[PDB]
Structure 1
Amino acid sequence: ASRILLNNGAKMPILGLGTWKSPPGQVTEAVKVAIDVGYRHIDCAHVYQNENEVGVAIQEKLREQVVKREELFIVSKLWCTYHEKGLVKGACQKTLSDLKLDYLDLYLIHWPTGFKPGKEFFPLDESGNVVPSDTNILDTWAAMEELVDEGLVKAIGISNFNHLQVEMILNKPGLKYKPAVNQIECHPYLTQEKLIQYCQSKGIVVTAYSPLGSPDRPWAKPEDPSLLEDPRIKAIAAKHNKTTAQVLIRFPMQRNLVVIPKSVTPERIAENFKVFDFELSSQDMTTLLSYNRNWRVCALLSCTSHKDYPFHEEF
């Protein structure tokens, strides 16, 4: 099955195209190719600095009548410098304008941490610590609920929230809409059993990011583990006559997760979509689960003293 039912009553394609690090001169053609070969979900963010160009592709394929808007599922995220209640509508409308859309299917709080508002995405003090904003997750959430009530977004969610932060929203005084999705890092080196079961127990759909371990992350180091080159995963791929990436994409799919691998390579964009015609065994699943090492691609040191930093917590 190609889509999962969200708690807002809408259906979300379980495979999406990621766009973090997709160069602006290549992401328009990447998104056009993806839509041509089947993708119907694009994961976006203002902080990726490429929403305009993603938007050009979406709008051309709509104008070409390759797809109807209702068949697309477009996701973006509120960046950390816009957590203030007074900045949230603007930030969403900048994304909508850039994407050439009149609504988003899902809008996420990108990170639980608010940063000082300004031009800078990562405002730092002279010692390199991120500068927080005094905003809290619950007031930001109410601001997200208003976007639903204005028709600018069909669903709201969170990203990089730990289980205590998820629980804080769920127990928020006067909560009007539950989060639909929690988008978190997840792959065989960061399997997240604990956080995923909590979220699913609550009817919150989990989207797995960096499912290939983000080989193009700009801070990669030689000693870091490498999913795509792990002989153990390679062997599972060979047994199935599939690529390693294809195993790494199908793995979250069978955990009832949405997965959003990124590429700007047309061959890989296509390859990455060809994951609905095979199955990993239970044993494969448990074997891949066993590779966990609590290894994170995304956990920037300069943010670790923020009050709301999500990754000190066990969950």
Structure 2
Amino acid sequence: ASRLLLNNGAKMPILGLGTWKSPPGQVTEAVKVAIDVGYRHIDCAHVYQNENEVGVAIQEKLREQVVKREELFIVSKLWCTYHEKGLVKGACQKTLSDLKLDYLDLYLIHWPTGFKPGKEFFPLDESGNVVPSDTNILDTWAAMEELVDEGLVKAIGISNFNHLQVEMILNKPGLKYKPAVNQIECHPYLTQEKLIQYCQSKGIVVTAYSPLGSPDRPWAKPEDPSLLEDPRIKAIAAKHNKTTAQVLIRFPMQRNLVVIPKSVTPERIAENFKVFDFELSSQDMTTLLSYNRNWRVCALLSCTSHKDYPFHEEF
């Protein structure tokens, strides 16, 4: 399987290139190399401040006729400060302009938490806590559905939503388009078995982010767990004659998830895409699943008091 079918009738490439932390001066090249080596899915976000440069790469590959638009699956996300109904279209249009596209294949609500609109991505009060906005995810969802009806995005989805929050949408009175995807953190240390089973049971595709444990996360404390250096995982990689990163990318692929490893290193980009020629045994799968620790790379600690903070619930 190269792609998964979404509840909107389209197929999403199970492997995509992530761009969080991909510096503006290296991500144009990273995306160009990725398409050249076969990637057909790019994960982006206005909050990553590098969409214009990712856009250059895409436009050049289209222009060079290396790939056609219908063959690409581009994803972006609505940042928290744009949850207000009157701000969603504008945020979507800014991202389409920076990426130089006429439509997005998928547009996601980045976080269930809406913040106060303004220039600051994380507006804080005189103590730090983020200043929420009185918008609710349901109203925000309605504005997202309007983008589909306006031709701006082909599918809409969510990210970092817990199962009760997914249920909130599925239960929205008047619900017109169900979320096609829920992109959540997923790797051997945060396996997400309940939230994934819940989503798949609802026909919602799950995209696993930080599949490698985001070793380049800014808040990395060199004492923290490290997937790429876990000997149990390297032994598994060793057995299949693959790299540990290849094992970590193949792992969610076999649980029927979409996976989006990030790299701005050409050789890594190529290496990461070489995950369709081997299979992990169900025994390897269950062993990897056993390493779960409920360890999160992205906990959004600055919003633990927000009404819609997603991680107080067990899933």
TM-score, normalisation: structure 2: 1.00
Deviations along 1:29-78, whole A, 9 cap, x unmatched? 00000000000000000000000000000000000000000000000000
RMSD over aligned Cα, in angstroms? 0.3
Identity %: 100
Tell me how far 1:295 sits from its aligned partner. Answer: 0.3
Distance 1:13 1:262 in 2: 15
Q: Structure 1 residue 22: deviation in Å? A: 0.2
Query: How many Å apart are 1:126 and its aligned residue?
Result: 1.4
1:184-263 maps to which residues of 2 (within 5 A)?
Answer: 184-263=184-263
SS in structure 2 opposite 1:206? strand
- Unaligned runs of 5+ residues in structure 2 are none
Name the CA distance, whole Å, in 2 between partners of 1:46 and 1:89.
13
* Residue 301 (structure 1) shift: 1.6
Provide the C-alpha distance between the structure 1 equivalents of 2:301 and 2:43, rounded to a whole number of angstroms: 25
- SS of match in other structure, 1:284: helix
Post-superposition offset of 1:300: 2.1
Tell me the distance in 2 between the aligned counterparts of 1:73 and 1:176.
23
Following TM superposition, by how much is the alpha carbon of 1:228 offset from its aligned partner in structure 2, in angstroms? 0.2
What is the rounded CA distance, in whole Å, between the counterparts of 2:314 and 2:196 in structure 1? Answer: 13
1:128 Cα deviation after fit: 0.6
Note the residue ranges of structure 1 that are not aligned, 5 or more in a row: none
Q: Secondary structure at the match of 2:25?
A: helix
Q: Deviations over 1:66-97 (max 9, x none)?
A: 00000000000000000000000000000000
CA distance in 2, matches of 1:222, 1:303: 24
Tell me the SS of whatever aligns to 1:120: coil
CA offsets 1:223-272 (integer angstroms, 9 cap, x no match): 21000000000000000000000000000000000000000000000000
User: How far apart, CA to CA, are the structure 2 residues paired with 1:11 and 1:250?
Assistant: 19
Q: Give CA-to-partner distance per residue, 1:271-297, whole Å, 9 cap, x none.
A: 000000000000000000000000000
- The worse-fitting range, judged by mean Cα deviation, of 21-30 and 294-303 is 294-303
Partner of 1:104: 104
Partners of 1:123 and 1:8 in 2: CA distance:
35
Partner SS state of residue 108, structure 2: strand
2:305 counterpart SS class: coil
Q: Secondary structure at the match of 1:89?
A: helix
Aligned partners of 1:74, 1:210: CA distance in 2, in Å?
18
SS of match in other structure, 1:24? coil
How far apart, in 1, do the equivalents of 2:314 and 2:275 lie?
A: 32
Cα deviation for residue 4 of structure 1 reads: 0.2
Partner of 1:6: 6
Structure 2: how far apart are the matches of 1:20 and 1:234? 25
C-alpha displacement of 1:179: 0.2
Q: Distance in 2 between matches of 1:109 and 1:289?
A: 28
Q: Normalising by structure 1, report the TM-score.
A: 1.00
- Paired with 1:104 and 1:273, the residues of 2 have a C-alpha distance of 23
Q: Per-residue deviation at 1:195? A: 0.1
1:276 counterpart SS class:
coil
Question: Aligned residue pairs: how many?
Answer: 315
Give the match's secondary structure for 2:31.
helix
Other structure's SS at 2:26 match: helix
How far 1:222 sits from its partner (Å)? 1.8
Q: Deviations over 1:173-222 (max 9, x none)?
A: 00000000000000000000000000000000000000000000000012
The separation in 1 between residues aligned to 2:162 and 2:273, in whole angstroms, is 29
Partner of 1:127: 127
2:93 is aligned with 1:93: yes
CA distance in 2, matches of 1:190, 1:26: 29
| Equivalent in the alignment of 1:276 | 276
Using the alignment, how far apart are the partners of 2:241 and 2:87 within structure 1? 49
- Offset of residue 313 of structure 1: 0.3
- Distance in 2 (alpha carbons) for counterparts of 1:30 and 1:314: 36
User: What CA deviation, in whole Å up to 9, does each residue of 1:84-119 have, x standing for no partner?
Assistant: 000000000000000010000000000000000000
